[PDB]
Structures are given as structure tokens and as C-alpha cells.
Amino acid sequence: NEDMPVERILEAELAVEPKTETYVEANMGLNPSSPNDPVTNICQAADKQLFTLVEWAKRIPHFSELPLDDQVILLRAGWNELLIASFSHRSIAVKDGILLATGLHVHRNSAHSAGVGAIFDRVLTELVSKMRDMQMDKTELGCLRAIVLFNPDSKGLSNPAEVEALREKVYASLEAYCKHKYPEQPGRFAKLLLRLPALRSIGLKCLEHLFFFKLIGDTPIDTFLMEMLEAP
Amino acid sequence: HKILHRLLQE
Amino acid sequence: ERHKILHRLLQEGSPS
Amino acid sequence: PESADLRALAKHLYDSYIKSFPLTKAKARAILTGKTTDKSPFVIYDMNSLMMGEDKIKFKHITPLQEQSKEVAIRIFQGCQFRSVEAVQEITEYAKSIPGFVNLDLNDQVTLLKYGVHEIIYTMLASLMNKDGVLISEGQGFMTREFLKSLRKPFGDFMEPKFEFAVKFNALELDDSDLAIFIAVIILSGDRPGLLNVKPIEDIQDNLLQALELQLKLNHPESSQLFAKLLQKMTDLRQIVTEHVQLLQVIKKTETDMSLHPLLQEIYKDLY
Numbered sequence: 001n002e003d004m005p006v007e008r009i010l011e012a013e014l015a016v017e018p019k020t021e022t023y024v025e026a027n028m029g030l031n032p033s034s035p036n037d038p039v040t041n042i043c044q045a046a047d048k049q050l051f052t053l054v055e056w057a058k059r060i061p062h063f064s065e066l067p068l069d070d071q072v073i074l075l076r077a078g079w080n081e082l083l084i085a086s087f088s089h090r091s092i093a094v095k096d097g098i099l100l101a102t103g104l105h106v107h108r109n110s111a112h113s114a115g116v117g118a119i120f121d122r123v124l125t126e127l128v129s130k131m132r133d134m135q136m137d138k139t140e141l142g143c144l145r146a147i148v149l150f151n152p153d154s155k156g157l158s159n160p161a162e163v164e165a166l167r168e169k170v171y172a173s174l175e176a177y178c179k180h181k182y183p184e185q186p187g188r189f190a191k192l193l194l195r196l197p198a199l200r201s202i203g204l205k206c207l208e209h210l211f212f213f214k215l216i217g218d219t220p221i222d223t224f225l226m227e228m229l230e231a232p
Numbered sequence: 233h234k235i236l237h238r239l240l241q242e
Numbered sequence: 243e244r245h246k247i248l249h250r251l252l253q254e255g256s257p258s
Numbered sequence: 259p260e261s262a263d264l265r266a267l268a269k270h271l272y273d274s275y276i277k278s279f280p281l282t283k284a285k286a287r288a289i290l291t292g293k294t295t296d297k298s299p300f301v302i303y304d305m306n307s308l309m310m311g312e313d314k315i316k317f318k319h320i321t322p323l324q325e326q327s328k329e330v331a332i333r334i335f336q337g338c339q340f341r342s343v344e345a346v347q348e349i350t351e352y353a354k355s356i357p358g359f360v361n362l363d364l365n366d367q368v369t370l371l372k373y374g375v376h377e378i379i380y381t382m383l384a385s386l387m388n389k390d391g392v393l394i395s396e397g398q399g400f401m402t403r404e405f406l407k408s409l410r411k412p413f414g415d416f417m418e419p420k421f422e423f424a425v426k427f428n429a430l431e432l433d434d435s436d437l438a439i440f441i442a443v444i445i446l447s448g449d450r451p452g453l454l455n456v457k458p459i460e461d462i463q464d465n466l467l468q469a470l471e472l473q474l475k476l477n478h479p480e481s482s483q484l485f486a487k488l489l490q491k492m493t494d495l496r497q498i499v500t501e502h503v504q505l506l507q508v509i510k511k512t513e514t515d516m517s518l519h520p521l522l523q524e525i526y527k528d529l530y
């Protein structure tokens with residue numbers, strides 16, 4: 001509509017939740033599988049959300065109009081940050097823990113026991129608590145994720161500048177949305193964009209881990225997550 | 233990227 | 243951690 | 259805050275910035291472009307030229323720590339290390355000039371510097387670079403990008419990421435007055451691991467952001483979304499830092515006599 005309608009971005013978010021129902025498969029009744037390791041329950045959810053991320057992306061204005069190979073490049077480059085941002089925001093509802101898309105609730109101490117604390121603590125403090133304190137809504141989460149998606153620095157793009165232009169269209173829609181919805185706080189726009197640095201370093205640190213939970217194997221992971229892990 | 237490429241083209 | 247020198251740099255600074 | 263307060267902050271940061279950093283972007287570009295009469299930089303494009311650039315200091319006053327004795331990579335490795343250590347000291351002093359900073363819990367001051375220093379070194383390193391190389395030794399020398407890319411094993415790909423970043427960062431055409439604020443905004447980041455009192459830091463950063471926002475609107479009236487494009491670089495910086503750390507780790511594993519200056523060891527110990 002207006003290059004980057006904030007409404008469609010919100011619709012992309014809502015379209016691929018959770019949001020009732022999806023929060024019972026393995027949290028209060030049953031639960032296929034039976035893995036004994038928080039890192040496993042997390043890798044499964046991630047693998048599952050990878051499929052939904054593809055659908056989410058197609059709903060972001062102009063993503064699908066990009067050349068198919070560019071679409072592939074963008075999603076391979078941003079999937080970890082895109083997924084971390086989702087579960088982190090979703091986790092605003094819980095205290096000291098994370099809510100997986102599989103409806104599974106991973107507590108702090110389990111992560112600490114599994115040996116992935118610290119990284120888990122960074123997610124909680126640098127992302128979840130930050131998202132909670134400023135109470136970023138789903139429209140905002142959506143735009144930030146769209147900004148992450150449209151990364152012009154992804155190696156291989158057929159037209160980096162086009163991607164940068166799309167990312168810039170999101171900056172404009174978000175800023176406009178913020179001034180109209182949050183005129184009481186002139187610096188919300190900046191506060192939002194400043195949630196990206198932490199997302200990047202945590203995303204990088206998370207990738208470093210995955211590349212360690214692979215080069216040792218022992219009861220492998222799921223296809224796709226594994227496909228995404230074949231390095232950019 | 234079988235899965236990703238396949239999921240994207242439908 | 244400590245960060246001895248960083249502390250010193252904040253405290254006084256650096257010589258000539 | 260009223261525009262006058264924001265304009266005062268910006269001028270205050272600019273002045274302390276000129277006092278903390280000897281080679282400003284304005285001067286650097288002037289040298290890089292060829293418009294300041296006062297000897298021009300010695301160009302180092304290969305091993306022989308690097309030697310006639312350092313041995314040129316032999317005749318000077320023996321100050322450059324370490325000299326030859328071990329390959330051409332260690333020479334560059336010590337030059338960057340030395341400059342880096344100096345930079346941390348200059349950045350530390352500039353940080354103390356940011357209103358509210360020395361009033362923060364000492365521990366948080368150390369943490370903000372710990373995590374902010376390299377991000378700032380790379381932001382400023384860009385001021386001294388163009389597509390073909392980078393200025394070194396207060397601008398007395400100019401080391402070519404190609405040459406640096408031609409170093410051995412992992413030494414050869416340390417700078418390349420920094421030039422790619424520099425090229426994209428320099429395209430924003432920021433000047434020293436814009437940079438003075440941006441740097442202060444990087445320092446006052448309330449998302450650093452281990453911070454004890456987050457609110458004070460975020461409150462100050464909010465004033466700095468408003469000041470940077472007004473500065474860019476006034477200094478760059480035709481450039482659209484510049485504020486947004488600039489803040490985005492803060493996330494780019496996290497990646498240049500971690501990637502550089504990972505590269506320093508390769509050196510550590512692949513060479514027994516790593517030997518990194520204590521201050522840099524202090525900063526990198528338990529970083530990100």
C-alpha cells in the first residue's frame with residue numbers, strides 16, 4: 001500500500017504465532033518425543049519455527065517480490081536472529097524463563113544446569129527484560145524483524161541496494177508508527193533500533209554454540225535447522 | 233538448500 | 243575480573 | 259530537553275573530542291585527499307616499504323616497541339596493538355567528559371568502557387580509511403588495503419572486514435561533530451553484560467540520542483533516514499568486534515608466542 005504498510009507487518013506476526021492452542025502440545029498434556037536436554041527441546045522448537053519463518057517472510061511486503069535466490073540468502077543470513085527475537089518477545093509473558101513455540105517452558109536453572117546459562121541469561125536480560133520494560137508491541141517486533149530480514153550485507157545478493165532500500169522503508173514506517181502511537185516518548189524509535197545490537201551479538205554467540213552441538217553430534221538434530229547450519 | 237528453496241517456491 | 247588498569251585510567255589517567 | 263540543552267551537549271562533546279583525539283576525521287580526510295601541505299604520508303605497499311617506514315623511525319627516536327626479529331606479520335600485529343592501547347586511553351579520557359559518566363557506579367564505568375572501546379576504535383578507524391588504504395602513525399604513513407589483505411595465514415584477513423565496514427560507514431559522510439555524539443551514544447549503552455544500574459545509563463543515552471538526532475537534522479538536512487542508518491551501524495559494530503575476537507583466538511591457538519598487551523588481555527577477558 002504505502003511501500004511498507006505497518007498493518008501487513010503486524011498481520012505477518014499474528015498470522016504465524018502461537019496465540020492459543022499451540023500452547024498445550026507439550027506443557028500440560030502429552031508431548032511427543034521425550035528428549036532429556038533443554039538444548040534439544042530448544043533445537044526442536046527452532047527447527048519447527050524455521051518452517052513458520054518462511055511463511056512469515058512471504059507476508060512481509062516486497063520480500064516475495066525479490067528474486068527467489070535473494071530470498072534464500074536473506075533467510076539463511078537472518079534466521080537465528082529472527083527466531084531469537086520471536087521467542088524472546090513471546091517470553092515477556094513469563095518470569096526467568098523462555099516460552100518455546102512448541103508450548104514448552106524452559107526455566108533458568110535448567111539452562112544453567114545444561115551448561116548454556118550465561119547465554120541464556122543474556123537473552124533474558126538483554127532481550128526479554130528490555131522488550132518488557134519498554135513494552136514493545138507486536139507491530140514493533142514485526143518491523144524490527146523486517147529490518148533484520150532485509151539485511152543488505154548478506155553475501156551473494158543480486159541487488160544489495162534494493163534490500164537496503166526495503167530496510168529503509170521499514171525504518172520510515174516504524175518511525176511514523178511510533179510518533180503516531182507513542183507521541184509521549186520521542187525517543188522510542190531509537191530505543192527500538194537499539195534492541196538490534198544485543199540481538200546480533202546474542203545471535204552470533206548462539207550460532208557459535210550450535211556449531212559445537214554439531215561438531216560432536218551424539219543424537220543429532222532436525223533437518224532444516226541442520227540445513228540452515230551448513231554455514232553462510 | 234533443498235528444504236528452504238523448496239518451501240520458498242510455492 | 244578486577245580490570246586493574248582500566249580502573250587506573252579512570253582514576254587518574256596516563257603519564258606523558 | 260530544550261533544543262538549547264541538546265545543542266550545548268553537542269558542542270561540549272565536540273570540544274572534549276578535539277581534546278581527546280589528536281587526528282580528527284577532518285584532518286585525516288585532508289591528508290587522504292592531498293590537501294594539507296606539510297609532508298605527505300609514506301606509502302607502505304609491501305614488505306620492503308614497510309621496513310623503510312619503520313626503519314625510518316630507527317633514525318628517529320626509538321619509541322616503536324619491538325622491531326623486526328620475527329616476520330612481517332608480527333610487525334603489523336604490534337603496530338595495531340600499540341595504537342589500540344593508546345586509543346583505549348584516549349577513549350577513556352573522553353568518556354569521563356560525558357556529563358553524568360563519572361557520577362555512575364565505578365563498576366559500571368569500567369563495564370561501559372570494557373564493551374564500548376573496540377566499537378569506538380573501529381568507528382574511528384573508519385575516519386582514517388578510504389577504499390585503498392588506511393592512515394597510520396598519526397597519519398605519517400598510509401598502509402594499502404591490498405597489502406594488508408596479502409599478509410600470511412590468518413593475519414591477512416583482519417583488516418578487510420574493517421575496510422568493508424569503513425566504506426559503508428564513510429558513505430554516511432559524518433563529520434567530527436556528528437561523530438563526537440555518536441561515540442558518546444555507543445559508550446552509554448545500557449545493554450552491556452554485567453551492568454549494575456541500568457536506568458542512569460539509559461537516561462543519559464536518551465539525552466545523547468536526542469542531541470544526535472538534532473545534530474544530524476541540522477548538519478545533514480538533505481540526507482534521509484540518517485539517524486536510523488547510523489544507529490544500525492551499532493549492530494554492525496557488534497559483529498566486527500566478535501569476528502575480530504574470534505580471529506585473535508585463531509592466532510592464540512596457532513602461535514605459541516601470542517603475547518597480547520595486558521590492557522587488551524584485561525578487556526578481552528570474559529567479553530563477547
Ligand SMILES: Cc1oc(-c2ccccc2)nc1CCOc1ccc(C[C@H](Nc2ccccc2C(=O)c2ccccc2)C(=O)O)cc1
Nearest residue numbers: 333334335337338339341342379393394395413416417522
Ligand atoms: C592496520 C594498521 O597497521 C598499523 C601499523 C603497522 C605497523 C607499524 C605501525 C602501525 N596501524 C594500523 C591502523 C590501526 O588499526 C587498528 C586495527 C585494530 C585495532 C584493534 C586491536 N587489534 C590488535 C591488538 C593486538 C594485536 C594485534 C591486533 C590486530 O589488529 C592485528 C592486525 C593485523 C594482523 C594481526 C593482528 C584490538 O584491541 O583488538 C586497533 C587499531
Ligand SMILES: CC1=C(/C=C/C(C)=C\C=C\C(C)=C\C(=O)O)C(C)(C)CCC1
Nearest residue numbers: 045046080083087100101116206209210
Ligand atoms: C536459545 C538458545 C540457543 C539457540 C536458539 C536458536 C538458534 C533459535 C531458537 C528459537 C526458538 C526457541 C524458537 C521458538 O520456540 O519459537 C542455543 C541452542 C545455541 C543454546 C541455549 C539457548
